[PDB]
Write an enzyme that holds these catalytic residues in place. Structure first.
Site, PDB file in Angstrom:
ATOM      1  N   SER D  90       0.746  -1.251   0.000  1.00 53.29           N
ATOM      2  CA  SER D  90       0.000   0.000   0.000  1.00 53.29           C
ATOM      3  C   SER D  90       0.812   1.364   0.000  1.00 53.29           C
ATOM      4  O   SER D  90       1.760   1.534   0.783  1.00 53.29           O
ATOM      5  CB  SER D  90      -0.952  -0.083   1.229  1.00 53.29           C
ATOM      6  OG  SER D  90      -2.191   0.532   0.864  1.00 53.29           O
ATOM      7  N   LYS D 133      11.697  -9.459   2.744  1.00 51.49           N
ATOM      8  CA  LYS D 133      12.102  -8.335   1.937  1.00 51.49           C
ATOM      9  C   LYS D 133      13.589  -7.958   2.159  1.00 51.49           C
ATOM     10  O   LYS D 133      14.355  -7.616   1.186  1.00 51.49           O
ATOM     11  CB  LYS D 133      11.239  -7.117   2.233  1.00 51.49           C
ATOM     12  CG  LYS D 133       9.803  -7.334   1.835  1.00 51.49           C
ATOM     13  CD  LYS D 133       9.066  -5.972   1.935  1.00 51.49           C
ATOM     14  CE  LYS D 133       7.545  -6.034   1.453  1.00 51.49           C
ATOM     15  NZ  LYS D 133       6.736  -5.007   2.345  1.00 51.49           N
TER      16      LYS D 133
END
Lengths: 195, 194, 195, 195, 195, 195
Positions: D90, D133
């Site tokens: 987002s 990540k």
């Protein structure tokens, strides 16, 4: 059931479609018009786009022959029933037909079954599925199915079925209207505008 | 379902394939009324072969000849219902049929055609040629226009070569040429193809 | 085949793609264009916004290097062949060379295929899938695949294609145009409008 | 490869995402900017909403601090590569980050991975996906990664696997540009607007 | 960690929902308002449409008991993190509580989680998953949980898991605000307006 | 339940549906009406078209026999709960009745469920899956069910299911209202303007 079979009613027309690619069915329509303050055609279900085109070709012919201009009427259409995996006929004549009736509020005969396609010049163009349908309508007990006359040879009917329904072929909408609208003054006056 | 003799404005016998191998004659009518912003109207299974095909020859409907499309509504039908029909795209037939309706120059019914049209107006090749032709011989269509690159692709089982005139084309005006009713209105369209 | 392979054609370029699993298509684009009888990129189907994009960013290298305005032309961009499950490249350049072609009427090397992403300030950015792509291109049977610089190290040709194609590597929009605008006066006059 | 791992660069950030269920990967950004005529945002491929959530939230901030109205620009963003089944975060901070750069035309350390979400208020928010990540990133050779500092407790990373990356926390945005943007007289001017 | 378990903020509320098959979790929203300058709602991800329809409802009430029209404004909704297989609650009250909060910037207590569908009439309807939910809640160190008055029987709070958490069950949104907004002079006027 | 099955309440009504093939559901509707602050229908999901349609037609009718006009109210039409693959009848009365409710604020017998389709001159036309529907209103215990009269003879209600629920044959929205509206003073000021 979902259709009437005897009687005239305004703006209600017994159409025909194919369910599966085997059996057929009466696709009963109702069309209704009220004034706007410029207009939409209001119709849901999976056959909405057939509503929409149908009126779109019929609008033209309304203005072109009566000067009546239906960008001023909101047009309301419901397939009396609900119709999954049903396939309509492009620009279903039965849809254009109910709208002509509504707008003119001349009643329509329901004993009289119908299906075919239609165009912006007013021709009744040929459709898939004739026999299934004639045959569906024999089933619903409708008295005469009116059909596009290019399909005269697509009709295939057991001698004995030939017999149960009056299959009437045609090819302009003004003839559909003559074979469906209730007799009277309003009708007479309307017919001649289609000259 | 299709007419095989005569001429009518806006009214072309395309050819397509019904699922596996089985060409169908696949007819259209196109019409045009002006707009009161201009749309394409069309329905059933092939609605989007319809809107891509008109929207895709738009340049060419105007940028050789007469009126811009986004100024008319374009009402298209396929005459019948076509489940499992694989149709061509930028259909020379949908284009031919619109042109025909706009100029009201009528079209030859005895002559089926298949092809993809392009934005510069080539007639790119398509598949199914032999299947489609057979449909055409089967239906009693007299000639058939195909793309030039599909010439090699046509394998007719003797007796059959001779049942149909197979006409190869390249450019959209060869197509129109060959199907429009001879007359002033065409002599005249034909020459605007410079 | 649904693709050419010799010829220098205008409004046209063999960009490459990837359908299904690791697979390759050659995906031919055709440009074609009109001073606008503001302007519009009229295109169609799955990769319409890619096209819009490839043209918008190619608009801009023309408006500022070449002195031009695309704003005044209806840019037709089409694709060639039917491919379900197909995947574009952001700004895919087989387009923008196809296009730089429409507007300069510059003829094209239909032996050079290509993939790649075009930035605004002019650069051949990298796109994933650089190997498989060289191969729908060896079947395509094509004598050159133009790629981006950054992507060289994703080239893993097996024994059956090493030395099978001229993989030409390029970084500015111009080494694309350089290795594929057919020779003469109008290229030279542009090539110096950029360089 | 589809990213740059060292030196600096107007409008490219090395953001981060997960691929299907679990791999970390790098999500390279180029954002670029051009004169309008009231503008839009151009993005194609799976990650288009993120990008335009990304930017419309990055403007109020552009104004309230720097008075540029992004209103009069036309922003162009693409993900460098081809990205299926990859889930961004987002209003991805890397992306608002590439845009401040282009619009301000101050370059960016490509040696610094980054991730989190940007509140329209300018908050840096916490995001799913750190450990992997940071791996995708320890795999890539990227020297440091900025993470929202709220995900500080969510970093598991191994004995041998620490030492190899600088995880740096942030809460506001004025701290990512601070920590990524090239040093220069440009940089100091801008840092000063965020007060 | 995706949420705050303590303290107060504006446009940030802790909803509750479920992970695919069986599972329950805390679902941090955050909703900010800037003037629309017409109001679109905006939000991305898998919860993206549980966001718009929840918001498009609420404002019957957002308009109706209190402050502002939201067609004038723009709604940015993010779920703090990322939400693979999570069914949110229809017309979510934690969304409504958030948007109301963001419009009057009156901070929410985050030690309280809430779940439930907001009617448009502003009643809370029952929602499934409740037992699970209260428990992610307990796992997560939150201090009190608002639930719907009708999911009461549905509270199968065991041995372990009683007395660890306060369940505040409710029937109106206006109750939801009472229990979680910050005691302040603005709130006292907010509450009287839902009279 | 998410479902009121006894009481009387304003803007709440019990629809029926056939989810999927034969499966019936009970699908409750919530109407809410807002003095447009011109005016517009507000609903969500697969059935917003239906609700808007059912509101269109309802309006023609209120505007008539009541004389109050509902372009001055915004119209909130919720459906309760998550079911999928559903097919609401055209102009569904569940809705139209919920409105005249939201609008005449006149609370409603929550023991009655109904299915139906509303014409603009207000006739109750018959719908499909009439049997399966009686059967889900039964299986949910509602003490009565309203149905299109033309559907009476398709009620394939067996010797098992014969004497379980008040089945109501109905021809027009007023009888529909006569029969679910709450005995008192405005109802009677209603029903009487409906003559």
């Amino acid at each position: 059931k979902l259709f009437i079979t005897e009687g005239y009613e305004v703006g209600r027309v017994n159409g025909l479609a194919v369910i599966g690619e085997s059996a057929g069915i009466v696709l009963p329509i109702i069309a209704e018009v009220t004034p706007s303050m410029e207009g939409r055609v209001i119709a849901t279900g999976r056959l909405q786009e057939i509503a929409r085109e149908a009126v779109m070709n019929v609008s033209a012919i309304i203005k072109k022959y009566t000067g009546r201009d239906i960008s001023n009427m909101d047009v309301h259409i419901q397939f009396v029933g609900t119709y999954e995996g049903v396939e309509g006929d492009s620009a279903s004549i039965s849809i254009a037909t109910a709208v002509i009736s509504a707008i003119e509020g001349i009643p329509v005969d329901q004993s009289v079954a119908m299906t075919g396609s239609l165009s912006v010049k007013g021709e009744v163009l040929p459709v898939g599925g004739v026999t299934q349908k004639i045959e569906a309508a024999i089933q619903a007990g409708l008295k005469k199915v009116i059909i596009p006359k290019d399909n005269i040879d697509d009709v295939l009917l057991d001698a004995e079925h030939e017999g149960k329904i009056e299959v009437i072929p045609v090819s302009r909408i003004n003839e559909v209207l003559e074979h469906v609208l209730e007799d009277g003054k309003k009708k007479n006056r309307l017919m001649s505008k289609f000259k």
